[PDB]
């Protein structure tokens, strides 16, 4: 762009180029037909040995599990992504940390209600998912205080910012812990947006519209689901995020929404995710409506891939590389069942 | 005993199948779900039969009918969370009936 | 209405039985459960059978067929009713029916 290259080459070069290896860097497609064509553990270690990944089993319980492969994936994520991260520059960095603020507001929010409830807090140490970091003190050994972990976690922890929403220390009992989740993750979200709308270059121009995406098909899937409970519309339209097209129009359809035909009338309004809708099989042995989103995802992330100047090429990496574990250990997962006619919930990337 | 048994593989093998999917959908819902245990929904009720002139042990499938813990936070995973809501609680009424 | 249903079983098992509501709290705050994997010990598996055992307020069991394999000498020894324990196969594994509790008691069967 206009800005970048006399000056985004200088300190993103390196960057680049790893994000672009790093997309080699999976498994190719020879090896998923070596994947599926063992139907084994042993041998799925020994042939995992062979690729990029593995050679990582060493240590570990002769007995081969699936959950053993969910783990090998998962920290060959947080490496790659401790690879990354270790690299960076005040903005990609911030970028970066934004990148993972999601994971942390899920992992704190794990934390919460172990304290609440009378549980140790070394029991929560092993528990927490992968990326979470908390070296950060005031929020451990707190003597199972509410108002302890309320200033811990407004003054210590860096996502203290969003909890000046979450605040008098009543939401902790007299609301629901998701419900909490849900407003962080809308106020983290739309700071996220604001953030990215700042740097008004290809970087705003790539995140925009994924964020209005992630925005939308989250209002969309929400919209499905809470037919089934305990919620009103206006409570409704408080935790959707404002970073949306809908909120310009959509949004108003989706708290009128009471069933499945009027949000399938929402999809309509959009012909870009009624494409999505229509491939909502759900058929045993082959793909689902969430993986009709992951696919647009998949989409979007090799659109960002093609241009080179801006930020969301290493959003992309995520989601592609969240979907490439999800096929990986769920391969595992029916190679251990030995159930051959289900193989099919996962999507190939790259 | 063995007609019961057979349903009952069939059954639970079904229902850990939506379990298997859910985890797919929502990935590691089971943290939080183990997290969340304070009240049941659901007690046995025990209650007797003279089939002759001994007295029987026998077991009746009683809902108390507690609030479930709806998860939807991880992804919005409720649409398999409610499949497997019937999946297993079919299952375990099997299981009392077996009992 | 009057006890407790109690399981024992890997994540996969207690997972979707907790999702079934399965699952209680005393006023000890002391669970009705034990998830066991490859890190839980037999001996542990049988102090906790035995502490369900002490309890008045349990009547069914719900044993994983590892479990069983695991403990077996204390299931068999306890030939009690009042623990109506009932044998369940894993998810990744053959559905267990020898060394069933009950088949050995017939004899004109399978």
């Known amino acids: 762009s206009f800005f970048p290259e006399l000056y985004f080459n200088v300190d993103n070069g390196y960057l680049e180029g790893l994000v672009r290896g790093l997309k080699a860097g999976v498994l190719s497609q020879a090896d998923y037909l070596n994947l599926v064509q063992c139907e084994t553990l042993e041998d799925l270690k020994l042939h995992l040995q062979s690729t990029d990944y593995g050679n990582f089993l060493a240590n570990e319980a002769s007995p081969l599990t699936v959950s053993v492969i969910d783990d090998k994936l998962k920290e060959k994520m947080v490496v790659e992504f401790r690879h990354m991260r270790n690299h960076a520059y005040e903005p990609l960095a911030s970028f970066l940390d934004f990148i993972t603020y999601s994971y942390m507001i899920d992992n704190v929010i794990l934390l919460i209600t172990g304290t609440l409830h009378q549980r140790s807090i070394a029991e929560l140490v092993p528990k927490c998912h992968p990326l979470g970091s908390f070296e950060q003190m005031e929020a451990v050994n707190i003597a199972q205080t509410p108002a302890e972990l309320y200033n811990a976690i407004l003054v210590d922890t860096p996502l203290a910012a969003f909890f000046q929403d979450c605040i008098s220390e009543q939401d902790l009992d007299e609301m629901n812990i998701e419900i909490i989740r849900n407003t962080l993750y809308k106020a983290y979200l739309?700071?996220?947006?604001?953030?990215?709308?700042?740097?008004?270059?290809?970087?705003?121009?790539?995140?925009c519209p994924i964020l209005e995406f992630e925005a939308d098909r989250r209002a969309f899937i929400i919209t499905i689901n809470s037919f089934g409970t305990e919620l009103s519309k206006e409570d409704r339209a408080k935790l959707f995020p404002h970073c949306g097209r809908l909120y310009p129009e959509g949004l108003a359809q989706l708290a009128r929404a009471d069933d499945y035909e009027q949000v399938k009338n929402v999809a309509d309004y959009y012909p870009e995710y009624k494409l999505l809708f229509e491939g909502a099989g759900s058929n045993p042995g082959d793909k689902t409506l969430e993986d009709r989103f992951f696919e647009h995802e998949v989409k979007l992330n090799k659109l960002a891939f093609l241009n080179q100047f801006h930020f969301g090429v290493f959003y992309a990496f995520v989601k592609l590389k969240e979907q490439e574990?999800?096929?990986?250990?769920?391969?595992?997962?029916?190679?251990?069942?030995?159930?051959?006619?289900?193989?099919?919930?996962?999507?190939?990337?790259f | 005993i063995i007609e019961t048994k057979m349903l009952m593989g069939e059954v639970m093998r079904e229902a850990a199948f939506s379990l298997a999917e859910a985890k797919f959908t929502a990935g590691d819902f089971s943290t939080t779900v183990i997290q969340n245990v304070n009240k049941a929904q659901v007690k046995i009720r025990a209650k007797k039969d003279n089939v002759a002139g001994v007295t029987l042990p026998v077991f009746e499938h009683y809902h108390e009918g507690t609030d479930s813990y709806e998860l939807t936070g991880l992804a919005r995973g409720g649409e398999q969370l409610a499949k497997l809501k019937r999946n297993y609680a079919k299952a375990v009424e099997l299981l009392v009936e077996l009992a | 209405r009057g006890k407790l249903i109690a399981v024992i079983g890997d994540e996969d098992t207690v997972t979707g039985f907790l999702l079934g509501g399965i699952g209680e709290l005393n006023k000890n705050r002391h669970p009705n459960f034990l998830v066991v994997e490859k890190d839980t010990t037999i001996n542990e598996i049988e102090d906790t059978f035995r502490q369900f055992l002490n309890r008045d307020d349990i009547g069914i069991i719900l044993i994983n067929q590892y479990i069983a394999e695991m403990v077996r000498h204390a299931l068999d020894?306890?030939?009690?009713?009042?623990?109506?324990?009932?044998?369940?196969?894993?998810?990744?594994?053959?559905?267990?029916?020898?060394?069933?509790?009950?088949?050995?008691?017939?004899?004109?069967?399978?």
């Open chain 1, 325 to 349: 574990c999800r096929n990986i250990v769920w391969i595992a997962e029916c190679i251990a069942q030995r159930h051959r006619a289900k193989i099919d919930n996962y999507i190939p990337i």
């Open chain 1, 190 to 207: 739309e700071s996220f947006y604001k953030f990215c709308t700042l740097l008004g270059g290809t970087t705003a121009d790539a995140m």
């Open chain 3, 77 to 110: 020894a306890h030939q009690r009713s009042i623990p109506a324990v009932l044998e369940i196969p894993s998810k990744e594994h053959p559905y267990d029916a020898a060394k069933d509790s009950i088949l050995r008691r017939a004899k004109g069967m399978f």
